[PDB]
């Protein structure tokens, strides 16, 4: 199953078949009619929904994977084709990872490029420092994990039963 | 388990425990009929293969003890079960197709066989499971002018 | 093979050797910190078009979602070390327009205006020198997933964080970012490694000169070495020829006729052709579970050297570190992280001493009857006078009342020498 | 909050679950229940049978066996965190920067939770700063002064010495600042008298 295209390969008398690099057939040549006849398998795809919950909203996006949008709302990202999604020029955190720098969340389902944070532009100069006047005593959460559940498996009564 | 005969100090997972069943009890149903197999096997006349005869068994008891005592069958092949596992077995969808070919066409009633019987006249499925039975016919089904 | 070049270290009971020069050393060290995000169609790599194939292919079970799963944990799991290794400041800081910092030269790290990236010449460096395969590897259900962070993003958080540290030393990374100027900075750093604050004052011009040739060095050693970036082009033939053998696994009979699943369909009837593919499908399972196993370890190992890049960012370009070779060879001063294809590297510029002078040295001064210790340094003497000095650059002081302590008699200590203790109160009082 | 100990669990769980749902699979043969084999088949093809299902078994729990083994891997790499983490933070206090909480680290306090640590660390954060005019030096009598253990700091009208991370203006004396060279050669020295105890 493919498309059959015009060729420039130029094969040998004897040969009939054409091999790519990974052996798949690249080209086949035709008895009847003694031309090569280039094979190139047909348009595919991933696809991925990308959602908000279903306690919030039923709306879903779709995005191509790797595949340009005039082979298939409409945005192009270099991580493939979005469908559903409108793009927003405005600039927030990432919600739900589209990729290539492109993100979406849900407000319809909106499309944008993640913010990597707030401008701060320090002043800097050659005579001036900046000294604390005051100070926060901060209380922050560190989450370790230490150890996993311990599991046993009798491999003849798993495999075998009685 | 460790392969040695001096075990040192510690806790060792060995085996599992398991309490053996004491008695088997077989339950099958109360009911019990003679299964018409003699309509099926020990008939007169059969049917040609386009028009094959279908037969539904159902509602009985069936001793296959007997098929295998009388039997001029050259061929008893069976596919998805065991000639000799049939008598401790229950079942539904039981048919009995019966038909007439040639000598060398039974090898085509069978699974994914290739011939004309098997394209145009009777066909299996792939995940056919039952025994097919063939036996010769010449002094039933033949005649010397010719049985056409 | 040699081990090294033969030392001997001229030991003595009573001899010390003081340096009289230092050295501002920048050196490299490149961190993978991400692969290279693959998916994998579990049904289209092992059957492709047939759906024959596929329904056999369903009674092995939950084989392709475990699968996917996985590579998905490690997809997430690539975009996680980028975050964690890059996106650790929430400010996005910029260098003030005049770009005079005392006399040190950070052009070949800040970025640079001219280039549409919007790179470091450093960095463009950096990525130019990490690099129908392709085609194939996606015909046969492969895929490559793009990274969340784009390249000039993460150039941008390296330009943030370089900022930072520039005009804010290591106070931007302990809460808000405090302007100081840059020769105060390096008084700091110099301090934190026990040098007095005059040395960088007195040779600023000096340091300024040696950091700007050590950041020549570098720019010119990363262009003249093929062997620089091993690391993460290690990485990249490590995920590009694990594709490839998935890929060319493809073309193995695995024990059946042919390898063309299109060809066992075309010849054989189904219940021998559901053997052949059965034998085709368990060999291609195989083949992409042991794929995924490589990958997984592969992760792990990433993910270990991701945390590590964290850990080098956040204590040697946030703040100063006192662990020893964690920031560099040398004592070190301060950390320039620079974005690269796969990873982070690390400009660590750190202090060697150099120009090493011998000196007798004692333990303590007897004056008085009383033993005298230093406070910060080491007593020295050239020969005939005693002085003290700090103990990581050669800078002789009179011995005072001011820079030593007095603790028990002369009796105790073993190897103390007599020396005069200069009081600064005793011209006072005489006037 | 706490997704980090539940995804834990929730892998361990789910790989369980998967392990039991091949017993499920027939993997090619003609039932995945062993007695219905026995049952159905004579010896000669219920030992393929039972090969099969053996062969695809096996295979499923050493696929298991195998993420066991990372997923421990991993865990161990959290746990020697952990305990670097109770070491370095807890039993001490910790110079290095981001590893035991965002600021300067003062102490930490350990709390059990389910397959995990969570570290309560107390940092202390610098806050309202203020800008002032800052000198590497003061030049008095012809000498340079540096500070001892501060920084050089004028509000606009005066100088004064203060501790780096907290603003406490006190008078430059020549208690805590040191002597070193003359005027000459630092850049950005300033005029400013040097008060003598
Ligand atoms: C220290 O003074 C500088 C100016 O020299 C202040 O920087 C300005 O801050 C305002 C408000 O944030 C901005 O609108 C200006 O653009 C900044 N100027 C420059 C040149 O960047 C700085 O805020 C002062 N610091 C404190 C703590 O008050
Ligand atoms: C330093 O900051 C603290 C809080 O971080 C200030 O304390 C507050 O002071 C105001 C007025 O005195 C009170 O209304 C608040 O309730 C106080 N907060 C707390 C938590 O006590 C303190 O005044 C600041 N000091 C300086 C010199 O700026
Ligand atoms: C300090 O003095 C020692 C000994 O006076 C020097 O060590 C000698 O170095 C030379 C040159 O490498 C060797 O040939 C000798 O064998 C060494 N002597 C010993 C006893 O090891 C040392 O070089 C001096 N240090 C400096 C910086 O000049
Ligand atoms: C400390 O070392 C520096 C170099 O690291 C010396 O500076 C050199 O001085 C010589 C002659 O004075 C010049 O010819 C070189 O061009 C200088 N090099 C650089 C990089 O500036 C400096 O003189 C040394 N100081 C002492 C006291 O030994
Ligand atoms: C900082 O260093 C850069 C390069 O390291 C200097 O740029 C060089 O300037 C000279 C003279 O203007 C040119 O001949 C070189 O071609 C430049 N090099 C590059 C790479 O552009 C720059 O002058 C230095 N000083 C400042 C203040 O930026
Ligand atoms: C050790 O150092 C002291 C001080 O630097 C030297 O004493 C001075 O030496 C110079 C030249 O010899 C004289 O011009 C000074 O008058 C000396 N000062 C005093 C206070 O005596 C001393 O010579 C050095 N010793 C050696 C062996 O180099
Ligand atoms: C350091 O000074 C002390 C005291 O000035 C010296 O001790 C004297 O040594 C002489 C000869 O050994 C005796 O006659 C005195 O009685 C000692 N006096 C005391 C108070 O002990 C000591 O010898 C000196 N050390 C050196 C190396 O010269
Ligand atoms: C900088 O701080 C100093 C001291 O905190 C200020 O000097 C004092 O100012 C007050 C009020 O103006 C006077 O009553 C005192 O007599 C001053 N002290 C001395 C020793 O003269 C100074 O005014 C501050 N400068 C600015 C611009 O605020
Ligand atoms: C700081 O004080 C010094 C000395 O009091 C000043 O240096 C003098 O400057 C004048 C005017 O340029 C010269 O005529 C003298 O020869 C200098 N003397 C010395 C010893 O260098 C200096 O100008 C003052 N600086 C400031 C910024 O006020
Ligand atoms: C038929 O096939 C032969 C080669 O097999 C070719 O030479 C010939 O031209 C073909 N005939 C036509 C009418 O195309
Ligand atoms: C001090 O800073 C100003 C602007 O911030 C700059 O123009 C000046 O050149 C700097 N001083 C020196 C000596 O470069
Ligand atoms: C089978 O049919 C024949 C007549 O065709 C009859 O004599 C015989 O008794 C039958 N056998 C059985 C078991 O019914
Ligand atoms: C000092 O060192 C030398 C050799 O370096 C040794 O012979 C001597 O015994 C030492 N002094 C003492 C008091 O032990």
Request: with cysteine.
């Given at each position: 199953?493919?498309?059959?295209?015009?060729?420039?390969?130029?094969?040998?008398?004897?040969?009939?078949?054409?091999?790519?690099?990974?052996?798949?057939?690249?080209?086949?040549?035709?008895?009847?009619?003694?031309?090569?006849?280039?094979?190139?398998?047909?348009?595919?795809?991933?696809?991925?929904?990308?959602?908000?919950?279903?306690?919030?909203?039923?709306?879903?996006?779709?995005?191509?994977?790797?595949?340009?949008?005039?082979?298939?709302?409409?945005?192009?990202?270099?991580?493939?084709?979005?469908?559903?999604?409108?793009?927003?020029?405005?600039?927030?955190?990432?919600?739900?990872?589209?990729?290539?720098?492109?993100?979406?969340?849900?407000?319809?389902?909106?499309?944008?490029?993640?913010?990597?944070?707030?401008?701060?532009?320090?002043?800097?100069?050659?005579?001036?420092?900046?000294?604390?006047?005051?100070?926060?005593?901060?209380?922050?959460?560190?989450?370790?994990?230490?150890?996993?559940?311990?599991?046993?498996?009798?491999?003849?009564?798993?495999?075998?039963?009685? | 388990?460790?392969?040695?005969?001096?075990?040192?100090?510690?806790?060792?997972?060995?085996?599992?425990?398991?309490?053996?069943?004491?008695?088997?009890?077989?339950?099958?149903?109360?009911?019990?009929?003679?299964?018409?197999?003699?309509?099926?096997?020990?008939?007169?006349?059969?049917?040609?293969?386009?028009?094959?005869?279908?037969?539904?068994?159902?509602?009985?008891?069936?001793?296959?003890?007997?098929?295998?005592?009388?039997?001029?069958?050259?061929?008893?092949?069976?596919?998805?079960?065991?000639?000799?596992?049939?008598?401790?077995?229950?079942?539904?969808?039981?048919?009995?197709?019966?038909?007439?070919?040639?000598?060398?066409?039974?090898?085509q009633i069978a699974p994914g066989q290739t011939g004309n019987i098997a394209d145009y006249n009777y066909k299996l499925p792939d995940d056919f499971t039952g025994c097919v039975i063939a036996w010769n016919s010449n002094k039933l089904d033949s005649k010397?002018?010719?049985?056409? | 093979?040699?081990?090294?070049?033969?030392?001997?270290?001229?030991?003595?009971?009573?001899?010390?050797?003081?340096?009289?020069?230092?050295?501002?050393?920048?050196?490299?060290?490149?961190?993978?910190?991400?692969?290279?995000?693959?998916?994998?169609?579990?049904?289209?790599?092992?059957?492709?078009?047939?759906?024959?194939?596929?329904?056999?292919?369903?009674?092995?079970?939950?084989?392709?979602?475990?699968?996917?799963?996985?590579?998905?944990?490690?997809?997430?799991?690539?975009?996680?070390?980028?975050?964690?290794?890059?996106?650790?400041?929430?400010?996005?800081?910029?260098?003030?327009?005049?770009?005079?910092?005392?006399?040190?030269?950070?052009?070949?790290?800040?970025?640079?205006?001219?280039?549409?990236?919007?790179?470091?010449?450093?960095?463009?460096?950096?990525?130019?020198?990490?690099?129908?395969?392709?085609?194939?590897?996606?015909?046969?259900?492969?895929?490559?997933?793009?990274?969340?962070?784009?390249?000039?993003?993460?150039?941008?958080?390296?330009?943030?964080?370089?900022?930072?540290?520039?005009?804010?030393?290591?106070?931007?990374?302990?809460?808000?970012?405090?302007?100081?100027?840059?020769?105060?900075?390096?008084?700091?750093?110099?301090?934190?490694?026990?040098?007095?604050?005059?040395?960088?004052?007195?040779?600023?011009?000096?340091?300024?000169?040696?950091?700007?040739?050590?950041?020549?060095?570098?720019?010119?050693?990363?262009?003249?070495?093929?062997?620089?970036?091993?690391?993460?082009?290690?990485?990249?033939?490590?995920?590009?020829?694990?594709?490839?053998?998935?890929?060319?696994?493809?073309?193995?009979?695995?024990?059946?006729?042919?390898?063309?699943?299109?060809?066992?369909?075309?010849?054989?009837?189904?219940?021998?052709?559901?053997?052949?593919?059965?034998?085709?499908?368990?060999?291609?399972?195989?083949?992409?579970?042991?794929?995924?196993?490589?990958?997984?370890?592969?992760?792990?190992?990433?993910?270990?050297?991701?945390?590590?890049?964290?850990?080098?960012?956040?204590?040697?370009?946030?703040?100063?570190?006192?662990?020893?070779?964690?920031?560099?060879?040398?004592?070190?001063?301060?950390?320039?992280?620079?974005?690269?294809?796969?990873?982070?590297?690390?400009?660590?510029?750190?202090?060697?001493?150099?120009?090493?002078?011998?000196?007798?040295?004692?333990?303590?001064?007897?004056?008085?009857?009383?033993?005298?210790?230093?406070?910060?340094?080491?007593?020295?003497?050239?020969?005939?006078?005693?002085?003290?000095?700090?103990?990581?650059?050669?800078?002789?002081?009179?011995?005072?009342?001011?820079?030593?302590?007095?603790?028990?008699?002369?009796?105790?200590?073993?190897?103390?020498?007599?020396?005069?203790?200069?009081?600064?109160?005793?011209?006072?009082?005489?006037?």
């Amino acid at each position: 199953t493919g498309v059959l295209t015009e060729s420039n390969k130029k094969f040998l008398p004897f040969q009939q078949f054409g091999r790519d690099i990974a052996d798949t057939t690249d080209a086949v040549r035709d008895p009847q009619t003694l031309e090569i006849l280039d094979i190139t398998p047909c348009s595919f795809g991933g696809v991925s929904v990308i959602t908000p919950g279903t306690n919030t909203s039923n709306q879903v996006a779709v995005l191509y994977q790797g595949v340009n949008c005039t082979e298939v709302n409409v945005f192009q990202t270099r991580a493939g084709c979005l469908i559903g999604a409108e793009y927003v020029n405005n600039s927030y955190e990432c919600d739900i990872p589209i990729g290539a720098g492109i993100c979406a969340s849900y407000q319809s389902i909106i499309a944008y490029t993640m913010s990597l944070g707030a401008e701060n532009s320090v002043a800097y100069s050659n005579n001036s420092i900046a000294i604390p006047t005051n100070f926060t005593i901060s209380v922050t959460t560190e989450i370790l994990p230490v150890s996993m559940t311990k599991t046993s498996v009798d491999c003849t009564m798993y495999i075998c039963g009685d | 388990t460790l392969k040695s005969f001096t075990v040192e100090k510690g806790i060792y997972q060995t085996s599992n425990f398991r309490v053996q069943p004491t008695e088997s009890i077989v339950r099958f149903p109360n009911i019990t009929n003679l299964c018409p197999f003699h309509e099926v096997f020990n008939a007169t006349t059969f049917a040609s293969v386009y028009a094959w005869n279908r037969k539904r068994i159902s509602n009985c008891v069936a001793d296959y003890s007997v098929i295998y005592n009388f039997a001029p069958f050259f061929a008893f092949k069976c596919y998805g079960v065991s000639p000799t596992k049939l008598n401790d077995l229950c079942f539904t969808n039981v048919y009995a197709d019966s038909f007439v070919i040639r000598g060398n066409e039974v090898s085509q009633i069978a699974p994914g066989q290739t011939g004309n019987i098997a394209d145009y006249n009777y066909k299996l499925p792939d995940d056919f499971t039952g025994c097919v039975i063939a036996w010769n016919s010449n002094k039933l089904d033949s005649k010397p002018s010719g049985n056409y | 093979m040699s081990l090294g070049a033969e030392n001997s270290v001229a030991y003595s009971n009573n001899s010390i050797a003081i340096p009289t020069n230092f050295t501002i050393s920048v050196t490299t060290e490149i961190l993978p910190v991400s692969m290279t995000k693959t998916s994998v169609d579990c049904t289209m790599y092992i059957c492709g078009d047939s759906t024959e194939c596929s329904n056999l292919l369903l009674q092995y079970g939950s084989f392709c979602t475990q699968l996917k799963r996985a590579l998905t944990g490690i997809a997430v799991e690539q975009d996680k070390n980028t975050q964690e290794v890059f996106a650790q400041v929430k400010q996005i800081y910029k260098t003030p327009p005049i770009k005079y910092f005392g006399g040190f030269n950070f052009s070949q790290i800040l970025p640079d205006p001219s280039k549409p990236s919007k790179r470091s010449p450093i960095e463009d460096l950096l990525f130019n020198k990490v690099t129908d395969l392709i085609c194939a590897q996606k015909f046969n259900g492969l895929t490559v997933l793009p990274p969340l962070l784009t390249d000039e993003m993460i150039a941008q958080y390296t330009s943030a964080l370089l900022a930072g540290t520039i005009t804010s030393g290591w106070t931007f990374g302990a809460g808000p970012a405090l302007q100081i100027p840059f020769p105060m900075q390096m008084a700091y750093r110099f301090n934190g490694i026990g040098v007095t604050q005059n040395v960088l004052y007195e040779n600023q011009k000096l340091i300024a000169n040696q950091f700007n040739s050590a950041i020549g060095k570098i720019q010119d050693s990363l262009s003249s070495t093929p062997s620089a970036l091993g690391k993460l082009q290690d990485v990249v033939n490590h995920n590009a020829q694990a594709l490839n053998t998935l890929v060319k696994q493809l073309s193995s009979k695995f024990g059946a006729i042919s390898s063309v699943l299109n060809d066992i369909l075309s010849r054989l009837d189904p219940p021998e052709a559901e053997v052949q593919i059965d034998r085709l499908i368990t060999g291609r399972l195989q083949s992409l579970q042991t794929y995924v196993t490589q990958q997984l370890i592969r992760a792990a190992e990433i993910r270990a050297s991701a945390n590590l890049a964290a850990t080098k960012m956040s204590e040697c370009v946030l703040g100063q570190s006192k662990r020893v070779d964690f920031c560099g060879k040398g004592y070190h001063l301060m950390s320039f992280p620079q974005s690269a294809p796969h990873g982070v590297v690390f400009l660590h510029v750190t202090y060697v001493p150099a120009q090493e002078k011998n000196f007798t040295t004692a333990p303590a001064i007897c004056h008085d009857g009383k033993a005298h210790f230093p406070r910060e340094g080491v007593f020295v003497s050239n020969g005939t006078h005693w002085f003290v000095t700090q103990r990581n650059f050669y800078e002789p002081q009179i011995i005072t009342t001011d820079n030593t302590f007095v603790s028990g008699n002369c009796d105790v200590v073993i190897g103390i020498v007599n020396n005069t203790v200069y009081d600064p109160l005793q011209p006072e009082l005489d006037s």
